[model samples]
Target: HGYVSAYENGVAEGRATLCRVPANDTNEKNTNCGGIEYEPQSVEGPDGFPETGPRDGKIASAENSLAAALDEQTADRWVKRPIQSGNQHFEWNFTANHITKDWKYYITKADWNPNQPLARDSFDLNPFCVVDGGMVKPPMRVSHLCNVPEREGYQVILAVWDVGDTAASFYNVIDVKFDGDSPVLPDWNQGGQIYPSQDLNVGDSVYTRVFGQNGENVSYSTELVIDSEELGAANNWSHALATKINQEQTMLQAGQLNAEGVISPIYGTNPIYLKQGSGLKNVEIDYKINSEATGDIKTEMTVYNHHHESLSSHSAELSDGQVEAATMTLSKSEPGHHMLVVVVKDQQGKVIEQNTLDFHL
Candidate 1:
């Protein structure tokens, strides 16, 4: 049994909505649009995107794209954002005041991990395929471009990749103005830059735009849930989880695949025996662990050295009562930043809990 409702405006036409609406709005605009979106009255598996493609609707294929983000603290400075318009490649120009000038940005996938696995791995490459079977996708640049240089900003006609992942989802156009009274949008006329007003303050709402590319005017918002910020910080730390995470030049490589048909994200969590006096203190940790059932759980902690070998490990028991205060100590074992590993198991020696950690001294 259901009822219909309607509202009239000044004109003859009117708008109508159901009498009973749910409290939670599973709308695409409701999500951050980092890369994923939800389908209305639809369900997907862990890989979300089936090898045959999503059936319910389009699911965001950039699973890790939204889940993994760059650690701003350790990220390289502005890099070239290559866009494909027609047959030639164009670089998106931008303006920045204080981006690190020491490093260079490169084309790379968000952090990959067996713990926090992404839906599709093939999309990690350049010229990603869209769920619609076209070569449309997001930009390959690591940095974002904003128009804030002048009260009259500029816009860049950038053609982003349209990976064949999420083709069936709704989207919306949301507007967010800069708190400083400066316009927070792309200035198509002027150079693509941000023009922050003098009144601009920290933690202020910056620019806002829907996930759109190539002036398609078809970026529809959807109901997607993701942990992008968490993924970024966690991915950087995930590198330490693997005994051999491309230690050559602090490279971040994808880890092994997990059981959920997804890849794991884990940083080194190997244990290092330390007795204090070490200058290292803050250790970064990246890990993934699925809880079969949230209750009393026992996990182990381990640390590794620069050589990518286990230094030592300690058995730490955790319970539902004390789990609230549960934390993996980096300094408990070694000094300097060491990779850590945590494994929680039941009495049957089965791996029920697993995570990675990276501790810095």
Candidate 2:
């Protein structure tokens, strides 16, 4: 079956560490967790859908997970909370999607290795929380009360939304830290930088930089979201802008860029002019990001038409000095003077660049 956008179509929300990643369709995954046997090792980032399984039937280590590579600990992108004893309330907010079979929540074991990619045995086989009864199709919010078990230090919590009507399920992972921990999460506005220099069109790609303090690793986050009102109308229309990048990041002591000439956040992509019925198929988006501050540069790109709908999206993991490219396919259904928007974001989920194009199709 063709893949349906999860983050593009629906979202999951919860309290504290259980809070879902940036809300949008970019985070969708299959019920099998990319065919990883639906085990604990599958607790990658919200966008951790590889379309294929590991040849060895196991993830080499925890760092192999996209979420692990994005942020280990003491980063602003990862949300933490003191481990609570019993009765945690979790919520799922959805705009439009299939029915629900159930919702399940899993937590890491106390002695699990924090530095390695998640493993099947890393968590209790059974879920700490489950909500399966009285489920209906979405366009509504669902809540559940889970009896959270106590744990020391920091742990990873995994949430799964099983679709009652489809073969797919959505997976979300959150990082939690116990109370009185020494690792301090960085403040949101610890430094200064401009994300998107300007609005992006459909096929335009702009390279932007994020700055850090004292050449140290800077922690931050950003997102591209449409109001729920627009999203709710998407089911009947075409597509709506969703979270393209969620709490992504650059590595420790990543490279830096000049503060001058940086553009303020424009929030949307550059306008696009599609030649109506031109048979346009794809648009190329490329970026050459250089951080003044040390680690690899991780970012995501999304394409949305003037109707506030997404056509294609992809994520890239670039070194401190590298040029990466992403491509989005255009839908041929409509073509009257359309506006295409593109977004590029950093690890902290901040929009480093937003470009747009005009398409006449």
Candidate 3:
């Protein structure tokens, strides 16, 4: 406890506790958040279709399709494609593939209210049900992941990707149910991480593109086929999955290196740590190097365990003054009080920048 804005005639008191700066919403370019963010990506070519990723509009149908090159979340909201461009009146839509069976699907979204801070005012859309194809062929291959309600109703969650050959883009999502042998709600939500449910009724199946009520066309992703083993895939300790390591870009410097051994360099550093319940994955280091003179500027980097042993090390030469930075991928076997140690050296082995990051690898 401490005192602040005290009155001249009386002693003031206040309670106190340490606090941390909130995380930025990394999901958007300018917005900041707590995790890594990826932008929309497509697999379609101008002339033909590709096996994965987003495709064009034309050849897209229940027969031809695509998927996310990376991954998706329960609350992931996709940006309609072609961008708003110079126009704002354009409306975009996502369509489910050919449905041959009757089932139910749920939709959700990630909405950040502009009036609030990055992490604040963010939420998923209200989920509503949509009609599935028909029994004919179960026009849609519904998975048991999203189960049928006991009241004789279906509740299947589906994820749809973008279109095939056309220049259209849309997205979709569904909650799933997967119990060992019977149907059970997976109780999974689109929070930070989600795993496959146990209900056998839920299995990933692929789907082609479909044109919706409007001119919008989208090719949703097929459920990735899952095996019994995957249920244990996420069984690792939560801390192991929640770990994170990153650098803080402090500054970039440019100057002339004199023949006497003077050199200019960009110096920056980032601190890394695991989330309360998360664990660490392999750490990734990226940087660029360049030189205007002898093209001999190189970087020598290393990571130190609690014991300060050379846990990891690397050396790279940027001949063209290549914008390359030294990178070191640490293994889980590293021991002791760990810290990420980075040092930039010139051809002469002169240290340009040396930084240390304390962490629990």
Candidate 4:
């Protein structure tokens, strides 16, 4: 039940509302986020990351659809904590305890795009800091000292907490603005207090005390309008499977259940949310093709395990752009987290629209 309190993840953004007694959901500030506002501590993904962690493009959300909001990525799109390079400190505040395995820290590469979805390729493969735990129970608080690489401008550092007892690890992304400070605190204050401390109450005498500064207490919103040019590389990753989970269910779409998976009847309105050990059946894919898109086209969907190995795949002929929905059957012989990639290709095998989804079975 925690997050990296150092740079503040999405929950710590925007007036720090999520830090309040009755936290506010981050959907407004951290657009398109999932249930993270209420469950920041539950962003657990498979263990053995980078090597076997949350899939690329799905790291921030921990491969869990419930925390998908945390996956949204863009440059300076979220609030960032100001920091400097070299021996930067990090800390974790846990409301609960667990048998901890280890703590790992990673940062985005120097050339990472500020306007694309986060992916494994976005960060350094090796963690800058690693603390082995040897499977001992953790205290309610933890801290790590790491030498941060030299970088300029905005960047993100990812924190991972793997519990030795459980097969899951929690993922937290910290947004930071590097070398962007001018020493706001009064340097002359080491001389002690100079004013009277008796007349002011919490509500009154708050002029220079509150309104004179601007920070995490009160947040204002500014609309960001991005055009196709701004959408850039992310808009062109080609078609992969896109699933939306409501009621905490899994999602997929295309047409029919020809593959070897069993689907819950409770679909269409939501992705089928079920316990582990099951497969997928009859997923409803919602897609919109370019009305001006010409030539013969078809959509193919593939189900891949965490290792990026294909388990099952299917494709359907598509000529019309308005094909509202289709059913896709899926089968997974192995266990662990899985990703569904939906790709739309033309007659010449050129890629068009693409999307993706991650789930557990």
Candidate 5:
């Protein structure tokens, strides 16, 4: 269940909640309004509206509960929110997000009186806007825009959220006046921009929003994919930008899209023959420092048997300009062919060079 915070209900920023209950008594419920201040989101009613839900005149509260305090009507009764006649966004700040069938919106007719009890007769039976909830659980805060019909002064907007798997729907009534020209909301999820076609501008914003909502999974797994396809790819702009990833760049030899979806990096390769190094207990690896880069460098020598189990591992630091060698101790390596992998790295630990050698165990 949820309530429209922009109207009378309060806002929710993360785990904290802000509602309308007064601070003075903090328990007051009377004259102007009542217990709704305590549980604004509990105003639930039958799922169907206009044809089946709450009977006429009780819609302001949906089901006749403490929220029914909203049923009472008067010219000067409740707060009149200033709204504009355009694409206005409505959001249901959910206390309990439920799988929903759709969200329906209704607004009072311009000629409707503010002094009468709010009823089906007071509102346009046909909703002004309808957002498909896709029969799936919605986010904690769901927002979508509706084209508000033109109205001069006081008005009431009714919003219903139909729970997909249940027979209940949550209702929220908003009192508004077409007196202020304000953009209703900054499209949350701007989903349209992301789902089908995500140019960098779209994915970037989508990434920004989700990062705050889901940082851990994001932190653990994320890699850059140079976004380009539509216009940017036409005149070789993408090719010009991507010397490593463009349509023309092909000779990919060593990268991997692993089972875990990690893009394990590619590296330089060397084809070579090898000789047995220092019997069994001690082994030496032949390698070379990269002439293409400078500063202190290092290498890792790892020996894996045919079954791909590492039998020996070692790291060696080198300042030499030409050839280099790394030594390690090994035991219990399966007898037969084995794999030797060597990788050289810089001070930043980024792979600068790689080598592989095949040898008999």
Candidate 6:
């Protein structure tokens, strides 16, 4: 009975809607595109084109109670949008549908003839933007940023949201008018090149670094993600590793250090030891930093306990061209294990990077 109700509700409410499309008038029996439900995993139209439509790729006209077709020459149903000089954002609203694999946008050819119904060949074969939504997909509202191509006059941008598990996809056609000159691409770097992979265990003090080329001032943002989800209980480790990290450059090639002095890279190139304890035993952590760097640089670190509590933290500023160090120290009363989390922030207080380390007491 529950499945029957949901199935009936689905039939009554429909699935896969295009937010950009205008709703039909009150008199129409099927308000949303004539209550059109494309078969699951289908893109082929009544004709054979992937997304054209019921007959000749015609959109249901808003003027005739879903009866008469929209007069392409004078229809005001299509929403007109301006193309910005750079990247643009688009969003789609979904209700209880499954996750998506990816989203795509296709534009009509510059010389396309608008007098006839849209044909498969009317658009450029390749999409202007394709975002990999991953197999997991997004939430109710799918918002994506994409670079819009430069073009003049009226254009139709076709959007597609492909379902991850199912072969089906949701589609929309947005009508837009280009008014300004094409925008230049940005010259800024998007992420901090933080070294050392994430994923660590108890009693391990993490070694981390950041680099910036060209001529830029870099700073970092830091945070400690702990297993118990407690933020304040964690400790800061910036001071402990400051000297040890700077030692990275002076370390001799494998041919130099004493056997006992040399530690395995598997444990991390530069790991600081700490007194540990237990409970969950292994303290999970999340950390990284982003910075706008120039000649002189500064980095910060913090530490956290196994129960997801904060410990202590420190910061260091380095001279131009000099290597910087970051470290941490932690100890626990009981036996077993715990975790240490660290963060790095820039002058503005924005998180540039952060990471977590694990160890036992």
- Per TM-score, the best of the predicted structures is 4
Give per-residue CA lDDT, model 3, range 1-361, as digits (tens): 0111111211110000000111122121111111212211122223211233323222112122332211222112211111111111211111233212322222222222222211111222222333343433321212322322221111122223223324432232211111224322122111122111111212322121212234323321112222333322322111111221011111111111111222221111111222222222222221112113244666556777776677677767657545554456775565457877666666656667777878774
Worst lDDT run of 10 residues, candidate 2, spans: 252-261
lDDT of each: 0.26, 0.41, 0.26, 0.54, 0.54, 0.41
Kindly list the per-residue Cα lDDT of model 2 for residues 1-361, writing each as its tens digit: 0111122222232221122232242221111122222233233222222232221123222233532332222222232333455676655555444576777677878787765655556667578877784456754555567777887656766666666665545554555555433423331112221222323333322322333333321133222332333322322111111122211432211111111312111122221111223322222222322222124545655555557777666677666766656566775547666655555655545666666777776
Which residue runs does candidate 4 get wrong by more than 4 Å?
A: 6-32, 180-361
Tens-digit per-residue lDDT, 1-361, candidate 5: 7776543232211100123632121221123245766677777888778888987778877765777677776654444555678786666778788888998888899899878888888999899999998989998876787888899767888878889888888777776656545332222111101111112321221121111223322221212233433422212221222222212222211122222322222121101111123111111111122122245787778987778888889876766464565566666656788888988896547687888899886
Q: How many clashing residue pairs appear in each of the predictions shown?
A: 72, 62, 62, 22, 0, 59
In candidate 5, what residue range of length 10 has the lowest lDDT sum?
188-197
Candidate 6 lands at a TM-score of 0.34
* Candidate 6 regions with alpha-carbon error over 4 angstroms: 1-77, 181-361
* Better model by TM-score: candidate 2 vs candidate 6: 2
**lDDT tens string, model 1, 62-135?**
12233222111111111111122122221221111112111111121333231221223412333221222133
- Residue 267, model 1: lDDT of 36
Q: How accurate is candidate 2 locally (lDDT)?
A: 0.41
